[PDB]
């Protein structure tokens, strides 16, 4: 019997959520008693970029239909919007057009609110700093008079430019910027926060204990975590990790920001949602010394079983003989399959364990190729045995990626893997290379020749030229490598 | 006189919509092309459950399909690949792929093919007791069929040896060609990718050598601006790699596209343009073509489709300025196609954008230490390119930054990953420049933020793509420890 914000933001730089994900969207916050979602795209040129420009009548048309669907599901709706890089805070004509805005907003329905002052510049216009001392006084500023032109309404959320750890001057604890928010913005209006980095790997309570000193108020989390609009492109289908649930007294909510391919972000929320629910109750305890309940590998399990109910089924009659030719048969995708995607394509930070192994033993008998290839010998017998045991279960591991991506591409139903065919298909055909790698290995006794496949070793090209730059960036160590022969 | 030249969908992968099918045939006619081929390896219908009629809510669908490609005056080719589990020598089976090719017929198709490809040898045990081979069979149903069906003006057959490499032992002598050649009837025409999957470039005797023992010209199925086999390139480059002079050795062209479906612009209206340069010619480096021209005319007509980039205030001569879109422009699309150029090559502003980078990086010792023997041709050579090189990683950031401000995104959108993943490498190199040619302003290890986020390798796939074996040149380069330690002990 406490407020707590806890959902989705869709605030990702990318080609936007359509209505029928977004109407899935709250279907599915609903059945996981998860209870907000805040609209802030980037890709909305009237959300941002051009933020004086009013909706249009087929926008209004589309804008309208969501705030209503979203309220049908039992779903807190947020409009947000992001002036920054164009707006002039001083000139109050400025601020009519944004009391305008949110207005016509407001008439579409919508009761909750949101100004981000996220990712813009430092420096005022001359005009500005001519009113106001601080960047973040002209902030305040406006914020405040727009919080009560609306009528103080319940939910209304502030994100500030400072908005993590790493991007506070010059740190958390003294930083004018954050101090002035704290004072002057009003105690109604809720600050965003993504931790102690952007995309944060850890939250550490101390880390909450100590923004929330400077703002007077426990912040909501925007929460960075499984996002993948940065850097190179990957996919994040691993569990909600590294955020105790301990946070969870000193919070006013988590708004998970996720991958921005719609489909990916069942775990993502799936356990977001067991994690709350765990310790929506708790009591604040006291746990940076200054006065059985969630595991990521559990809940995660969870999520994988019920996802599998969105795969669905897979594809007088023929029957062939005994010696005719057997029929083309699609089978379904199991729950090993889930298990072994979600570990393979699994966190920012780390992959996950059925990944992890992958990896160390094709390591391992990359390092120990040696052991069988003429050489001294037998130099040892079992030692051999080993890597020729070891190389075949690899083989067969190997074996279960591909089957993963048959079994996905079968199942009736296409629309969750065609949403992120390209990942899946990058892993999927550079194993097939690294299972016959293993094999050549094995062989390369009574041949010197080079490891080929039909003469092109094309393994060279992945990324294309996007590729060929970032392979040449610094790394530590070429104790792997594995040169070939000319 | 009469010549197949258009597209193929004939991809692995999610299909072309019924909206852009439309308007695919809308740009074969304005670009006077002929052509298209229905061969789309996911539709289940297609191939994998080839036996299944198609539903009524289908059948509507392929009807309209259909009716557009004769409103804009295309032939259209309806595929169908039973090579999975056909069980050749028995009769219901032969009924059912009759019965199925009527259904489409009533749908109101002319023109039908065959497909044998990307399938094993392997023959089941009743159908070896029957056909002498796999090609005796493949050819004993097909010649049947297109009989059946009143011998179409236009019927095709793909073969499961479709290239050089895929022959055995050789095109030449293969008995597998041989014999399609002999026995598969003169009326239907053989489908052809070159000397590999992928052909680089169709040499005119590797086609004279493949038209003899299949005793007939090949239509070209063309795999060169293809991705459906490795979804992590993109190919905006022009049709080139074959001569202007096997236009009247074979009896058509029909190119296999990018999955993406507005990445295949200047890959269909340079084959055009390329068709066009010698329609009409006879028998006995390519005078009539030069794709560095056909690119250019293409990316100029290109750039009316992105559109006009999106926009009563007025600031102050000392309040802050308003936001302004720019426009897309030419040495835009002129960029991003040489960063997304062809299978085997890059463009020659990629291709230069690379070689500066990498001179960089092997002459960094000279600005590492102090200043030396460091003379116009060491030091401020480097200096120089360098700075030369900084901007115009800061023209890729541009082309994105331009191509994102479109009002129309379409065209965008659909290439996002592959021009994304592009600009937020040429930011990260950008970045290693600058630290590499002031690394005396203090020691640091190269970073940002404060770790290195190009080490993840752009995901686990990534992790193991490196440790598959390598060059053996193009030099390495390391990042130095953190100096800073933490024990008396050594």
């Known amino acids: 019997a406490r407020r707590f914000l806890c959902g989705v933001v869709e605030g990702f730089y990318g080609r936007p959520w359509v209505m029928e994900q977004r109407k899935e969207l709250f279907r599915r916050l609903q059945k ?256 940076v010394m200054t006065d059985v309940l969630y595991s990521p590998q559990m809940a995660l399990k969870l999520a994988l079983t019920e996802w599998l109910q969105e795969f669905g089924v897979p594809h007088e009659q023929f029957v062939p003989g005994p010696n005719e030719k057997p029929l083309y048969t699609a089978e379904p995708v199991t729950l090993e399959d889930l298990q072994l995607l979600a570990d393979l394509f699994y966190l920012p930070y780390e992959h996950g364990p059925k990944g992890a192994q992958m990896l160390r033993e094709f390591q391992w008998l990359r390092a120990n190729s040696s052991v069988v290839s003429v050489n001294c010998k037998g130099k040892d017998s079992a030692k051999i045995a080993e890597w020729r045991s070891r190389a075949a279960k690899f083989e067969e591991m190997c074996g279960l990626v591909m089957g993963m991506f048959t079994r996905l591409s079968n199942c009736a139903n296409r629309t969750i893997l065609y949403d992120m065919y390209s990942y899946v298909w990058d892993i999927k055909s550079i194993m097939s290379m690294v299972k016959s790698f293993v094999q050549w290995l094995g062989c390369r006794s009574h041949s010197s020749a080079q490891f080929l496949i039909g003469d092109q070793e094309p393994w060279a090209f992945r990324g294309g030229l996007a590729g060929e730059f970032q392979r040449l960036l610094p790394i530590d160590g070429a104790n792997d490598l594995f040169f070939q022969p000319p």
């Open 32 to 287: 996981w008693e998860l209870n907000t979602y805040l609209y802030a795209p980037k890709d909305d040129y009237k959300h941002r970029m051009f933020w004086r420009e009013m909706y249009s009548v087929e926008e209004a048309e589309q804008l309208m239909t969501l705030i209503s669907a979203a309220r049908e599901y039992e779903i807190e709706f947020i409009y947000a919007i992001s002036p920054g890089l164009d707006i002039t805070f001083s000139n109050p004509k400025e601020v009519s057009t944004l009391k305008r805005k949110l207005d016509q907003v407001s008439q579409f329905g919508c009761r909750s609110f949101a100004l981000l002052f996220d990712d813009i510049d430092h420096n005022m216009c001359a005009a500005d700093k001519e009113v106001f001392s601080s960047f973040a006084h002209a902030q305040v500023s406006i914020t405040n008079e727009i919080y009560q032109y609306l009528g103080e309404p319940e939910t209304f959320l502030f994100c500030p430019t400072e908005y993590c750890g790493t991007f506070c001057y010059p740190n958390v604890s003294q930083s004018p910027y954050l101090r002035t928010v704290g004072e002057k913005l009003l105690p109604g209006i809720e600050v965003l926060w993504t931790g102690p980095k952007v995309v944060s790997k850890e939250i550490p309570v101390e880390s909450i204990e100590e923004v929330s000193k400077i703002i007077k108020r426990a912040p909501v989390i925007w929460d960075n975590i499984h996002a993948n609009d940065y850097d190179q492109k990957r996919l994040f289908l691993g569990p909600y990790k590294g955020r105790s649930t301990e946070l969870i007294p000193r919070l006013k909510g988590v708004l998970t920001n996720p991958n921005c391919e719609f489909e990916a972000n069942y775990v993502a929320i799936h356990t977001l949602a067991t994690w709350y629910k765990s310790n929506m109750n708790g009591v604040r305890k006291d746990v």
